[PDB]
Amino acid sequence: PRKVLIISAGASHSVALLSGDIVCSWGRGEDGQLGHGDAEDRPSPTQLSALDGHQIVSVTCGADHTVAYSQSGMEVYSWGWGDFGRLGHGNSSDLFTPLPIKALHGIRIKQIACGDSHCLAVTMEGEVQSWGRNQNGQLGLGDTEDSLVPQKIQAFEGIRIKMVAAGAEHTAAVTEDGDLYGWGWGRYGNLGLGDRTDRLVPERVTSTGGEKMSMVACGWRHTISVSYSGALYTYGWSKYGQLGHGDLEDHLIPHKLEALSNSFISQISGGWRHTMALTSDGKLYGWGWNKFGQVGVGNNLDQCSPVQVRFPDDQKVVQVSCGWRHTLAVTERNNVFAWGRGTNGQLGIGESVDRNFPKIIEALSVDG
Template sequence: MFANAFRVEISATEIEKALCYKFAGNVVCSWGRGEDGQLGHGDAEDRLSPTQLSALDGHEIVSLTCGADHTTAYSESRVEVYSWGWGDFGRLGHGDSSDLFTPLPIKALHGLKIKQIACGDSHCLAVTVEGEVQSIVIAKALKIALRRSTLQVPNFFFHRCELGFLLLRYTTGNVVCSWGRGEDGQLGHGDAEDRLSPTQLSALDGHEIVSLTCGADHTTAYSESRVEVYSWGWGDFGRLGHGDSSDLFTPLPIKALHGLKIKQIACGDSHCLAVTVEGEVQSWGRNQNGQLGLGSTEDSLVPQKIQAFQGVSVKMVAAGAEHTAAITEDGSLYGWGWGRYGNLGLGDRNDRLVPEKVSTVDIKNQDEKMVMVACGWRHTISVSSSGGLYTYGWSKYGQLGHGDFEDHLVPHKLEALKDSFISQISGGWRHTMALTSDGKLYGWGWNKFGQVGVGDNVDHCSPVQVQFPHDEKVVQISCGWRHTLAVTERQNVFSWGRGTNGQLGHGESVDRNLPKIIEALSVDGYGGKQLEASKVDPSSGKTWVSPTERYAVVPDETVQGHAGAAVPVKGNGSDASVPENDVKRIRF
């Protein structure tokens, strides 16, 4: 405990991350979670008590601000703003997305006298003594950069949108439905509207879609009869595979994959992979940690073949936020990409730019092979030929299921389910689901929104069985970021977890911690007979501009032009991703 006379300033992130104090004499201390370098001590270790941040000794820091996983500090005497921690989305303002474990001055703010800094989850703003706002925004280009724009504070409003997953399912007759968050066009209905209940994706009528895969803000579909892979949604980093970073609000075939017979597609946060029937793997999108497996960290705007698998037939792939896993036809397990939490299973925390075989699987029978793999955000799940379940990687919320919260750098068998034969697995952001061969569903991990489905909102570090009405057996499962879906043997569809954008499909925006039937898609409901259909209406007057930036700050008074005509909305130097006639869709 510190006396009030000794304490000068405190800054705490709102979501349990880190804490910083500045003491008299300008000594900065930090403590709490440090896995992303946000404490500034040059490592990724947590600190259980205040620790002096030596890197800022003598800098005469006058203010400190914490974001979700990053920190800023301002030196009035040096007229410098420093930042460090997790660099994803350019939140540190240094012109890239690299993490920093010690403070570094932001060049673009050098010499600006700052009176206040605010940090959100993944964006920052600084107010100068002249009343100008300097914003660090998420750029809609391959190079993430800090963009400076002079904004008069009273004339602007700010709003931050929450990232999430959408849901899709194809019903009898290959009718594709989508619902949930749609602000990046990921629902495919030609607009950026959310859908609270399943809505028929008319653009794919008659395409005989056989598989659908969702990324964080984008979607892919494969038509076996047309031999085409379609993609749509947020196009940043080339994740749609069309050779640019433009968003798409309706499905478009990927030219580079035309004519390739695909047996599986996996989508990560901002990268994709496709496995052909010959066992070759194509990858595209973001690659800052080598998750594409191409031997570099260059993003790829179009699909490229992973040459490291030359002569090896791949059975399936799985994509996490920034890492990838694969199973080959001979039962070998591979990992590559971001490895900080041991999520590659290779026994260390290093990244890999090309696929590397996992040789340290905890299997007693050496003849046993791996047959299935899935990825969560920062953890990985695999299943052996005997039905054994193995997990590894990040376990901050118990998502590995081993009864603790410790990371595992190599695959370890889940003893709690050792007597069950696992038939399906799925990984969410921080939770995991596993289905047994007798139709029982188990969940564990992060449960803030009830996504584990066991009737509470408490995290679980060991598997807990999910109960369904009338003890219906489950035949299919899928995890979103913070919600879960299941199909039962009776052909009823259930969902639970986060529902803020309608992703549960119940016609409302309510969270659920127990499975609830989606009546529009279920036999014991409407059975797909009363689906809404959404089509692009050219007569609506809405024109969707292809954005060059994901976020924009827009003045109220620029909404209408002469005679009430709509004026193209501008912000930070480029068009915002909104209809020109609908300023309510502006995102920040």
């Protein structure tokens, strides 16, 4: 019957895009991130009626905002906390219902990324637009002033971007031809440039190790990058064991993960202080902070080395999104799973309780 196409975990909230082009959301509602007009949490997945019939093709979560967009519509909608203009409407009011972005109408969008308070869009042609808070340069526009409305990184003109990723206050980008970029706040070496300085214009990473990057994903203060061999590189902060190399050191350049050397990483997601990674054969690995059991192995002990989150009858996962204190994953069996902090209802499982092993979201699954 009905199945999940996309999941996405913000800080204390999480969203799902269902067949029927249906958006639904659940979790903390206090800042408007859910878009049901009201400010109350949803402990159970609620339909987002304002976006019924809008032919939304893809959702993406910030920390306390949410963007979505329509390809038939050529119309990009945002809602949630509006401060510093992360929503992009040219003002900074909070939205509690989805409103389109006059500034992007009629553009063909390829990818949209969201950090803590800045956003980036990618055109099909491969240009970039940033908007939101810019205090440490994250917008990558050459200065420090916030931009309340989307604006083109001229520093990219003629260079075709393949995808970008946003952390708390920085940004990353692999290109079509494989080069990797970082810019923004960089006090924990999270830009891969071998130092602890910010950057206001994108800066090419040279210490790839001569290997071209296929995709990048940001956590809060650490960055993840996969290459073409399937090799996985991490860099930035690792106070909490999220870089994943068995210790807790910082890495100012991309440091290949040894443990998962023998796996082809097809997908990556970064959270607040943990990490998650997807093999070709659908095994999922987690490591990082685990106070609320958001890594997934039935305990509340933190993991500085990749450990395998186990499932019922070992179905394969096909998607994984990381929040600040929780994780969602989708399996091949068209089932949906959540674990971690459940207090604000971001788990969807009707009760606001913490779970350290993956629990099944009854309202979004063909169970068994």
